[PDB]
Amino acid sequence: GKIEEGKLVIWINGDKGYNGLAEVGKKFEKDTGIKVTVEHPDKLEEKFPQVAATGDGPDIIFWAHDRFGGYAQSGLLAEITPDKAFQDKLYPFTWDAVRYNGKLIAYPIAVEALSLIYNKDLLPNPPKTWEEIPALDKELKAKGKSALMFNLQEPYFTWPLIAADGGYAFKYENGKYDIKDVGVDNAGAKAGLTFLVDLIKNKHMNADTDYSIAEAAFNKGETAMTINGPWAWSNIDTSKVNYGVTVLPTFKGQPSKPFVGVLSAGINAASPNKELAKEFLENYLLTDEGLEAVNKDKPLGAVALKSYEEELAKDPRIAATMENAQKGEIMPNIPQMSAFWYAVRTAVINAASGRQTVDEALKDAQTGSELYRQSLEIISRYLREQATGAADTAPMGASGATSRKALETLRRVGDGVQRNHETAFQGMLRKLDIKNEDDVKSLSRVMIHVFSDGVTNWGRIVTLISFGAFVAKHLKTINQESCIEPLAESITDVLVRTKRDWLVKQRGWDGFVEFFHV
């Protein structure tokens, strides 16, 4: 659990140009004598927050920007402070992708969007619409071919279709996200996912198709089309398939809307090599020669570095990438992105396999995506009204009947728990000696340990929240009212991270209201 001083360890996904990145590392070593180790572990975006929370992990982590707000919120990333001269070398919108709570939390590398990739020897002109794909598959099947194969195991690849007719993650209006307004189970999301499931039902696609299977089929000339990003072009070049890269098909006359990623490089907050990491990223990697080395291995997309992007922009494949990007949306970096992706991943897989209907699958995904914010609304309101004696007059907003009814229920059962268990609550409050915001921050680890052990039920959830209210009352009394919202956030995090799957299975807070009815 200690990052080694005087070297650099870098993590990057196994679909990216990690051999090219290692070449940049060798150049760094030639100048400095500092060895750079590039690794591409499986599930690195899940491994990183686990290991970094213990003060371990790589010095530098590469991922699309969407994961980084969660990492930064968890205190796992160093703030990035490049000088004006350096900042001005990258496009401003790329810096925007790596800004979280007003601070830069990573270096942007390149802009990624999915495109339609097609075999010109099979399909001289690609389909403009999703709706024509079934007929094209029929035509191709008579030749011993298929129309389309792409990864159905990762929702990144299916999202463009889900979003086309009106699906959305978190609503964006007036230059701001409404994190309360989730668009996973609306008519538009349903229409797109139904189209996908119908392709499967009608044997135009197979629910088991993954990245490797689709890549192999396209590169062997068995399927006429795939959906993939710039990183895939190297292996297609090697295959000698006569390919094009183009705009994704429309659905119901509307563009497919890919979620656009900015490949980014963050520095681990626990690294003792922050200056070496900055030097590597700014003066080795984010140069024309550094990016070229990575790009020659696996293409990056539209790079963040203006000078190199000027050269690459003439490539029609990059132009197509950017056309698809302009039709899509830059991913949020809010901490709830991880949960959104987990929820949608499960929905797509379950709908595609027939384990759930489209309606069932997307209802669950909606609940899972809404879970943190709805839970926080309820728990924050209860803790604060308990502490102050007065309720919050603000409207509940989205799913407001559920929030209101859950709060009403919690008032009843939670007040009962605080009364009946006053002795244990008072004893434990005194033992914990919670005085300030640092002490509140220290609670998460012990709360997880206690709460995650043993049986799962709504009663224990009430105890968790009710003791929170008991602590909040204390905090207010000792003029530490500012600690209550951080406490609420911490409790909510514990609840939703430890009980996610069970909570979704209960219909979330609707289950709670029903469980304690009368």
Ligand X SMILES: OC[C@H]1O[C@H](O[C@H]2[C@H](O)[C@@H](O)[C@@H](O)O[C@@H]2CO)[C@H](O)[C@@H](O)[C@@H]1O
Ligand Y SMILES: COCCOCCn1nc(C)c2c1CSCc1cc(n(C)n1)CCc1cc(c3ccc(F)cc3c1)OCCCn1c(C(=O)O)c(C)c3c-2c(Cl)ccc31
Site for ligand Y, rule CB under 6 A = 421, 424-425, 427-428, 431, 443, 446-447, 450-451, 460, 463-464, 467-468, 471, 487, 491
Give the pair of three-digit tokens for residue 461: 């959830």
Indicate the SS3 state at residue 5: coil
Kindly identify the residues of this chain, within the stretch 128-167, that bind ligand X according to CB under 6 A: 154-156
Residue 23 binds which entry of ligand Y, ligand X, none, CB below 5-8 Å type-dependent: none
66 secondary structure, DSSP code: G
Figure out which of the listed residues 23, 112, 309, 370 binds ligand X, where binding follows CB under 6 A: 112
Residue 244 binds which entry of ligand X, ligand Y, none, CB below 5-8 Å type-dependent: none
Residue 311 binds which entry of ligand Y, ligand X, none, CB below 5-8 Å type-dependent: none
Figure out which of the listed residues 64, 116, 291, 462 binds ligand X, where binding follows CB under 6 A: 64
Torsion of CA 18, 20, 23, 27, to 10 degrees: -110
Residue 15 binds which entry of ligand Y, ligand X, none, CB below 5-8 Å type-dependent: ligand X
Residue 450 binds which entry of ligand X, ligand Y, none, CB below 5-8 Å type-dependent: ligand Y
Q: How far is CA 331 from CA 115, 260, 263, in A?
A: 16, 6, 11
Nearer to ligand X, 154 or 437 (CB): 154
The Cα–Cα gap between 98 and 297 comes to 24
The 10 Å Cβ neighbour count of residue 430 is: 10
Name the minimum Å distance from CB 518 to ligand Y: 23
Q: Are strands 223-228 and 115-119 parallel, antiparallel or unpaired?
A: antiparallel
β-partners of residue 405 are: none
Interface stretch with ligand X, choices 62-70, 267-275, 373-381, 440-448 (CB under 6 A): 62-70
β-partners of residue 62 are: 265
Name the minimum Å distance from CB 417 to ligand Y: 7
The Cα–Cα gap between 507 and 493 comes to 18
The Cα–Cα gap between 446 and 394 comes to 32
Nearer to ligand X, 17 or 127 (CB): 17
Q: Which of 306, 305, 298, 368 is nearest to 337 (CA)?
A: 368
Figure out which of the listed residues 160, 255, 261, 368 binds ligand X, where binding follows CB under 6 A: 261
Name the minimum Å distance from CB 488 to ligand Y: 9
Residue 447 binds which entry of ligand Y, ligand X, none, CB below 5-8 Å type-dependent: ligand Y
Within its chain, how far is the Cα of 34 from the centroid?
Answer: 33
Name the minimum Å distance from CB 471 to ligand Y: 4
Kindly identify the residues of this chain, within the stretch 29-48, that bind ligand X according to CB under 6 A: 45
Kindly identify the residues of this chain, within the stretch 339-398, that bind ligand X according to CB under 6 A: 341
Residue 468 binds which entry of ligand X, ligand Y, none, CB below 5-8 Å type-dependent: ligand Y
The Cα–Cα gap between 158 and 207 comes to 12
Name the minimum Å distance from CB 265 to ligand Y: 37
Is residue 311 a contact point for ligand X (CB under 6 A)? no
Nearer to ligand Y, 103 or 419 (CB): 419
Nearer to ligand Y, 187 or 446 (CB): 446
Residue 59 binds which entry of ligand X, ligand Y, none, CB below 5-8 Å type-dependent: none
Name the minimum Å distance from CB 447 to ligand Y: 4
Nearer to ligand Y, 322 or 432 (CB): 432
The 10 Å Cβ neighbour count of residue 85 is: 8
The Cα–Cα gap between 21 and 23 comes to 5
Name the minimum Å distance from CB 339 to ligand Y: 21
Count of residues near ligand X by CB under 6 A: 13
The Cα–Cα gap between 203 and 221 comes to 19
The Cα–Cα gap between 166 and 160 comes to 10
Residue 155 binds which entry of ligand X, ligand Y, none, CB below 5-8 Å type-dependent: ligand X
Is residue 170 a contact point for ligand X (CB under 6 A)? no
Nearer to ligand Y, 52 or 461 (CB): 461
Residue 465 · residue 414 · CB < 8 Å: yes
Is residue 15 a contact point for ligand X (CB under 6 A)? yes
Residue 112 binds which entry of ligand Y, ligand X, none, CB below 5-8 Å type-dependent: ligand X
The 10 Å Cβ neighbour count of residue 241 is: 18
Give the pair of three-digit tokens for residue 113: 């969007």
Within its chain, how far is the Cα of 301 from the centroid?
Answer: 20
Q: Which of 28, 90, 88, 100 is nearest to 60 (CA)?
A: 28
Figure out which of the listed residues 23, 66, 165, 185 binds ligand X, where binding follows CB under 6 A: 66
Tokens 């991913």 map to which residue?
331
Name the minimum Å distance from CB 171 to ligand X: 19
Residue 11 · residue 39 · CB < 8 Å: yes
Torsion of CA 78, 338, 487, 429, to 10 degrees: -100
Residues that bind ligand X (CB under 6 A): 13, 15, 45, 64, 66-67, 112, 154-156, 229, 261, 341
